[PDB]
Design an enzyme around this catalytic site. Structure first.
Site, PDB file in Angstrom:
ATOM      1  N   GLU C 258       0.834  -1.208   0.000  1.00 57.47           N
ATOM      2  CA  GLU C 258       0.000   0.000   0.000  1.00 57.47           C
ATOM      3  C   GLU C 258       0.869   1.258   0.000  1.00 57.47           C
ATOM      4  OE1 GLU C 258      -2.711  -0.306   3.295  1.00 57.47           O
ATOM      5  OE2 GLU C 258      -3.516  -2.224   2.593  1.00 57.47           O
ATOM      6  N   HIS C 281      -7.862   1.130   2.042  1.00 59.01           N
ATOM      7  CA  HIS C 281      -7.655   0.779   3.430  1.00 59.01           C
ATOM      8  C   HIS C 281      -8.498   1.700   4.357  1.00 59.01           C
ATOM      9  CE1 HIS C 281      -4.561  -1.246   6.335  1.00 59.01           C
ATOM     10  NE2 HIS C 281      -5.713  -1.019   6.945  1.00 59.01           N
ATOM     11  N   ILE C 282      -9.773   1.867   3.993  1.00 55.86           N
ATOM     12  CA  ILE C 282     -10.663   2.705   4.793  1.00 55.86           C
ATOM     13  C   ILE C 282     -11.724   1.948   5.606  1.00 55.86           C
ATOM     14  CG2 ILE C 282     -10.212   4.902   3.658  1.00 55.86           C
ATOM     15  CD1 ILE C 282     -13.034   2.218   2.785  1.00 55.86           C
TER      16      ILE C 282
END
Lengths: 400, 400, 400, 400
Positions: C258, C281-282
């Site tokens: 990421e 990545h929320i």
């Protein structure tokens, strides 16, 4: 004008009824807290258009003969045994009751009783009041994980099922005209299959189903509840299988013979048996059901008086017809004389009034016709007067 | 080897306990269906490592004096009044009960009783058995829409709340150490506020709160249930406010004085009162609770015997310490002599054994130390023998 | 006095943290909306007792070397990759994160994504924005009646299950350390069984499990969601089986690699594929999770500073010990030197102070001991000063 | 005999329809996977009694002119824009659709979209596919605790409400003909009040309500969903308030102008806007809705063909009349010529056949009369032939 419609309410009918009448424009309401004797009733009903009663007022042919103006009867109760239903019908008077108001009261009672019975709470409390002390887990059980078998899966049956599920019971039902699954509630293939595989069986048959043979098919240690129909269980056979210890308990709200009032002795072969809850036909008797009855029956009466709907009448052909914002609406109650439809249609043609819709329903005693037409004013009055004179006519009126 | 650990189970403890022991490697299980007399108990316990009892077996100092090998007692019940708890503690014997197994049984009972009380079902059934017929809606109510006030919002309180909500009740709680809202369940600001605004109050105080003053604050027509602590309500005051007709009913499972067995007369001033359900301390007494008790208490006993955990012991310092896959684990029970920790640490150094973790907890009678160490084999045996000899030591053992 | 404890909060930590500190007596709070550079951080941290950070502040050995007074670090986030955890540990500084705050945010996301994927909504909307019109029922399905397979049945897994059930899904789970049934949620016997019999598989493994082999075991037309661990799925294999049309869609929040910030390009072989939802990545990134993080991490920091609890610290031996209302409580962090326990106990004896309870836990770098003792006033100060001087001591303090 | 009734099914109508026909005794079923051209349709329909179509088959006056035997049309879909409804009516052909089959598919979509919109998932995924990385909590929110405002509380509205509640939303509704509270779901006093106090507004108006003025009343940061009627929102005004950042997102399934097929360009001013989900009118398009449509529409067609019920017909007077187990049942469709009722009644008298019940309903084009009568055998055939000859008659038949 609706303030000219004389509404007479007897026996302390809930105030929700009085309010519903008022908000509907039915302001002419005489409300009494008591039943009337034959003589006062004859006097008071003499000019009544709508009467509401409860369980004590007796409405017989003799009373209807005195009721010059009466169009409808409201039984502010589930039962209708206090009204001569056929006599009312023959005079073109529908009688409305409150068939669904009791639903929640019956469903809650069943659920509370399942817990009391599986836990043997009633015999324990009788014993404790007398000084006994029966502290023991044997034969005492949680309802979570147990199977409730429901016989008759209508309104009450399914509410009973809902509540039983929230208590962690597995719920099955037997009903002759439903085989659908509802979430986790599954149909049994037969009454016998349901009886054999339930821990508790509760009867909710719509208005003997359970004989000794059926009771002996139930699981040893199981429970029977009947808060629905008084002739559905052989109570002598129930007493026997309870005394044998085949069934562990029962709750019964309804009996083949019930006292003709609270001032006469009640007898049943279940009396004196352990873990039997006997209730005096109160499954539907709550303050909240009384309130809902007041609204339900008044809604029916208001709709009948305004637009002639008889859906839900217990003694009358069931007619409903969408109202229209123009023209005039008629109703006509008659004897079933052959050719009366021809006479009715002919009257309307004669006055050049066109019928836009109509609904006729008939039974063994009467035909009931509701009609939407395009007549107005005096032309409608004249058709009314003439249809009132057709031989076999019981009554007719204009509607809103 | 665990098959060398003598487990003795008395009074018909559920088979779920026997199975749990077996699956844990505790195969040496003597299981009896009955209580033993003093003499048989002295004989049978003489070589027992673990004993399980129910309500009839009395465990006194005299019995422990005969119990050469006993490490732990399981009370296969909620209460522990049959064991001399302090005598056990002073001998380094923890006693475990089943504090949460009863939860569901109490919660179901409360909910069933709320329905019976609001509907006045018990007096109606007493009357029906005797030939009376009380068919009436007055004073009879649905639980849907009503407020339940819960005093003590722990395990049972919140299960009671869950079930009451599914029945359409509004649920509030008062608890001195919780003010959080749980979905639709809201805290009251005070006990008095809860009492004043509830239709039904149910007591669930964790192990007199309700005096005449508190009862008179409750709504006219309200109901009290106490299925929690026997000294929490002034029952003479409850009898009075019931007879006055201020409160409409009550259900009570627990009393300031309860018979010392099912073979002695029970007395309470509530006896003979209308709409009072009296139950002989059976709130937790179901077949399913007995099963859960068998598992719960055996889990505690297995964990104590394997790794020395005493969390949940009712008479003992509460110790828990994560086990490690290598080295050796020790426990040591002692009198609280100043400097005993120094002596213990010194023994370990002397044998070159390093302690990786430890947990000491103490009370007025004993200190209990559990330790993870890196010793193995004979070095660990030698440290064990030496720590057993420190003055003030009650017992010590190696653990898994 | 707690108003002397310097709390420094960085990067716009939620106001729920500032309030929690204040209500706890921690009034000395410096709260900044931004991250600090190395130089400002060295200056600002120089006198800090407690620091709270988010994702941008880097806490390295060099920073700790400047932090003369620092006792604890709060990572106001799920991850802790911005702190040198071992460096902190070796200086006796626990680091606390917010491991459970994100739970609801992840669970809601999964449920919304199941609907979008089964309905193919994302490719339809991409197409509609571009002028395409894909009005068709083929391959578009309701979630009611479908099976969700949940891999990892912890906190998030079970919340995901709850919500999926309310949407009418059948829910199964595979978890290596749980085989219990929860209402209608049943365990699968194996990962493969779960994969083969689910319409949607959602990964919730606690902090490659899914290889091409696993993907090919899934039902043709099934869906994969991974909102849990970035290295759990072979995304190249996922891209292949998606392009083949074996799987019908996926949603992925976490990736093997990421971007090191929002200012660098993201790359994955799923990019450009139809019916793939890619999220940066929320899964845990909501305003409400930020609020809960502020409370959760502050609670941990307050409890550490008051009474030395380190349960939940991500880099430190986990110690908790019930506080007592009298005497004094001590903590001591040290190197694991053999015999240090003896030295500690000896110091306490020397000052005639008795230890009432204690908990030691150790790891590869440090031992952490918390103790309750009966010393008071100056005698406790003297024991503190002396235990600080034992060789191998990292730090020690008195506690509340 | 029903095996003589020619049923023609087009365009790959679900197999649930074919099975329903068969189990009803309608075994003569031609089922095609495709639409037919004008020429094949004219040929195939020439002898059809019942036709089922989907969205591609065009049923015009020209087609009906070729359909010598056609009694009913099934639109196996929600919409009916492919059939000339008035042309069918004037030929006495009711057209039935599937108005409720789509309910669950619309409700699930709304709920998934609420989550995607509040979390801004769609723009995040568009960005991620392109290599962007928008990891941030700002403007991203949980649905739990938020208020959903539902405009139109019918079938779909209340299912939407049910699901939203299980997701922890507070649900309110505005509907011009309902003010009742349903558990925790409360009515707003007005549309404006609902708009002002909701976080998300979802439109479920039964078959512009939302102008720029209405959009500007909504809370800053709120969301609009329209999966109901294509002309209910000013989408140009929606684009503006989205670009201003007054509203944070929208999902729209229905548009003032939609492509006349999947092979023509779609245009809307929302295209290219951030956090807008555009769906090609698929709210009701699932495999499961297709199945339910097959059953729903076939049930209507079977009931029409057996007993003449037209309740639910989209183009026809709505008639339902309880069937009787004896005598004969007739239906008659006619022009609304004054006096036609007289002629009909006269025919029945002439043949000495008594009508036991009947229901007439009329609209601007036709009258539809269904009758229960006591004629049998040849007497009924003769009345049929004669009522077919009354001037203004469109068609008549005997029924079961």
């Amino acid at each position: 004008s609706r303030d000219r419609i004389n509404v007479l309410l007897l026996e302390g009918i809930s105030q929700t009824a009085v309010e519903y009448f008022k908000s509907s424009g039915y302001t002419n309401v005489t409300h009494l807290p008591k039943a009337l004797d034959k003589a006062d009733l004859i006097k008071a009903i003499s000019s009544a258009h709508i009467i509401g009663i409860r369980s004590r007022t007796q409405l017989t042919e003799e009373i209807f003969a005195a009721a010059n103006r009466l169009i409808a009867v409201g039984c502010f109760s589930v039962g209708t045994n206090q009204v001569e239903l056929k006599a009312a019908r023959k005079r073109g008077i529908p009688v409305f009751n409150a068939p669904f108001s009791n639903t929640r009261s019956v469903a809650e009672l069943v659920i509370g009783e399942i817990i009391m019975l599986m836990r043997r709470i009633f015999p324990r409390s009788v014993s404790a009041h007398a000084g006994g002390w029966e502290k023991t887990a044997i034969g005492s059980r949680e309802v979570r994980g147990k199977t409730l078998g429901i016989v008759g899966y209508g309104n009450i049956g399914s509410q009973v099922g809902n509540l039983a599920e929230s208590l962690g019971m597995t719920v099955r039902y037997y009903d002759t005209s439903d085989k659908l699954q509802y979430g986790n509630v599954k149909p049994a293939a037969s009454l016998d299959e349901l009886l054999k595989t339930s821990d508790v069986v509760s009867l909710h048959v719509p208005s003997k189903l359970i004989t000794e043979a059926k009771l002996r098919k139930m699981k040893k240690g199981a429970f029977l509840i009947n808060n629905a129909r008084g002739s559905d269980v052989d109570l002598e056979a129930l007493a026997k299988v309870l005394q044998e210890g085949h069934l562990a308990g029962a709750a019964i709200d309804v009996f083949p013979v019930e006292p003709a009032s609270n001032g006469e002795r009640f007898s049943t072969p279940l009396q004196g048996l352990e873990n039997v809850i006997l209730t005096p036909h109160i499954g539907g008797s709550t303050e909240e059901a009384q309130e809902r009855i007041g609204t339900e029956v008044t809604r029916k009466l208001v709709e009948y008086s305004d637009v002639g709907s008889t859906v839900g009448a217990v003694n009358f052909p069931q007619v409903q017809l969408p109202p229209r914002p123009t023209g005039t609406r008629f109703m006509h109650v008659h004897e079933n004389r052959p050719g009366i439809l021809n006479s009715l249609m002919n009257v309307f043609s004669h006055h050049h009034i066109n019928i836009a819709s109509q609904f006729l329903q008939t039974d063994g005693e009467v035909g009931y016709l509701v009609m939407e037409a395009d007549g107005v004013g005096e032309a409608s009055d004249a058709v009314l007067q003439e249809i009132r004179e057709i031989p076999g006519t019981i009554r007719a009126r204009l509607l809103y």
